[PDB]
């Protein structure tokens, strides 16, 4: 039903938008009355680089799924790159993590189900990897769908963004940190780190080089066995294997028992978020 909403919105121009509330801002189109999310990216790069980036950015039109954030368009204005997407009113899960402190386990199960289905969809249709799986890049609405966003779709834009924000927290797999072969197992590592981070609310153990050193030379932290059932620790220790050879692939995440029993549970996310806000 969301497809026809883009159909009644034609050309998008910077003068037709207004300030409401890189950097991310919300925008609205006044006769339509819909809400759009604008991402602003600053780059000091060549004109030909900007045009091949925008030529790689059009691909997001055919990226259509209930597990992927919808897309409107992208253009150039005032020496800046503008990315227009459809707005999640619930925000990313990082902000509601700061709001609530901890998240009930079935909600993490539903998030895990959504992200693994999104990874399967992305690897089947475009054969590309996400590269940036962290709780700031995953979004929820007031309705209940959980979608991925800001994935590595444009290699030239990745080269442009390769040097910018400093990095306070890092969720990136070791095997790409040595510079070796990386695959979807990197995104699986990042997903496991994200879920344990929202499980306990803080990193359970410094400058960024110290985190890099701790990640490369030491095994990741593990949950106590006396608190939660052993199946969830089995989930996270299959997701936190250092060597990607025996680290679990998406097929035995699909036939894993915890994902099945979380799918069997009926968790109404919209009702709990409405109880959260009021």
């Amino acid at each position: 039903a969301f497809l026809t909403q883009k159909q009644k919105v034609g050309e998008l121009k910077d003068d037709d938008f207004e300030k409401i509330s890189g950097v991310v801002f919300k925008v609205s189109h006044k006769p339509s009355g819909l809400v759009m999310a604008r991402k602003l990216i600053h780059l000091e790069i060549k004109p030909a680089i900007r045009n091949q980036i925008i030529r790689e950015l059009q691909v997001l039109h055919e990226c259509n799924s209930p597990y992927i954030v919808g897309f409107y368009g992208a253009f150039y204005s005032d020496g800046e790159i503008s990315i227009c997407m459809e707005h999640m009113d619930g925000g990313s899960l990082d902000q509601v993590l700061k709001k609530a402190g901890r998240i009930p386990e079935q909600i993490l199960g539903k998030v895990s189900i959504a992200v693994i289905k999104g990874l399967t969809y992305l690897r089947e249709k475009h054969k590309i990897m996400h590269r940036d799986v962290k709780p700031s890049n995953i979004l929820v609405n007031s309705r209940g769908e959980i979608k991925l966003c800001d994935f590595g779709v444009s290699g030239q834009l990745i080269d442009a963004m390769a040097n910018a924000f400093v990095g306070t927290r890092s969720y990136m797999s070791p095997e790409r940190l040595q510079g070796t072969h990386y695959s979807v197992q990197s995104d699986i590592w990042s997903m496991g780190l994200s879920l344990v981070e929202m499980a306990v609310g803080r990193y359970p153990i410094m400058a960024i080089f110290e985190l890099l050193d701790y990640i490369v030379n030491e095994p990741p932290p593990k949950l106590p066995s006396g608190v939660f059932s052993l199946e969830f620790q089995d989930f996270v220790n299959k997701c936190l294997i250092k060597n990607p050879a025996e680290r679990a692939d998406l097929k035995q995440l699909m036939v894993h028992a915890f994902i099945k029993r979380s799918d069997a549970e009926e968790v109404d996310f919209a009702g709990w978020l409405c109880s959260t806000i009021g």
Partner: protein, 262 residues
């Protein structure tokens, strides 16, 4: 150095504003609705460093602002940054004036070290090529006089030193970090491309430099260059801080290689 608000008119915006005050001036205004006292002491340190700098190769400080939002008044440079000349527009520079740029900015950093100033943020965006011939060094917001725990680094990771990155010392910032940053400026200056261009991961670059595995590649230096220049380039990028040469020897080497042209 007090300037009241009503004489400075904020004409055009290119954060930074092109204003008019007894001439064209560049105004660095910090538009913060809630000024914390940390930004206050940072501003006081910045202006205290800027009052001690008077040299033709340094961007010239003229005044500051106190009320409304904090602002810094300096002269308006005509032209573009060395990053914009080298990686955005690709002006075809010839060899001679590239070594002229090198010796001029080396003179600027030598004067800063003589006046006991650590720039701490030496990179390509801080090099203004003023009417295409004169170099200016600016943005001393992180400049500090030597005389405690150092603040967290915030600049780009390319021009930092390995002992800056691993930061095992309380104050790893010194002359030799600026020397290595100048060496990276020389590296991009003689080649025209950013170092480690084959790596597109920020944390990978940070870790590979911090463990000392990665190094700049001198293979893209043309072989028609004199071997003293490539020897200087190899010497200024040396990892260990105690054998990196100081700026007067760098200037001596540059003038020695300049003198030999018939």
């Amino acid at each position: 150095w007090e300037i009241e608000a009503s004489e400075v008119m904020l004409s055009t915006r290119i954060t930074v504003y092109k204003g008019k005050w007894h001439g064209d001036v560049a105004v660095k205004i910090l538009k913060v609705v809630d000024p914390t006292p940390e930004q206050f002491q940072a501003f006081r340190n910045e202006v205290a460093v800027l009052r001690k700098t008077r040299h033709v190769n340094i961007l010239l400080f003229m005044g500051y602002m106190t009320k409304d939002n904090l602002a810094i008044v300096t002269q308006w440079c005509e032209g573009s940054s060395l990053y914009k000349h080298l990686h955005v527009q690709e002006t075809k520079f010839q060899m001679f004036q590239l070594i002229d740029i090198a010796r001029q900015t080396a003179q600027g950093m030598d004067y800063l070290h003589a006046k006991n100033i650590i720039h701490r943020d030496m990179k390509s965006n801080n090099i203004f090529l003023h009417e295409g011939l004169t170099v200016k060094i600016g943005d001393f917001g992180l400049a500090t006089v030597k005389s405690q725990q150092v603040e967290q680094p915030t600049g780009s990771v390319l021009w930092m030193a390995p002992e800056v990155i691993r930061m095992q010392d309380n104050n790893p910032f010194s002359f030799q970090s600026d020397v290595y940053s100048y060496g990276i400026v020389l590296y991009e200056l003689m080649t025209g491309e950013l170092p480690y261009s084959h790596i597109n991961n920020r944390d990978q670059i940070i870790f590979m430099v911090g463990r000392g595995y990665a190094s700049p590649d001198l293979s893209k230096l043309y072989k028609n260059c004199p071997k003293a220049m490539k020897r200087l380039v190899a010497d200024c990028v040396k990892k260990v801080k105690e054998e990196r040469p100081l700026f007067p020897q760098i200037l001596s080497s540059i003038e020695l290689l300049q003198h030999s042209l018939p």
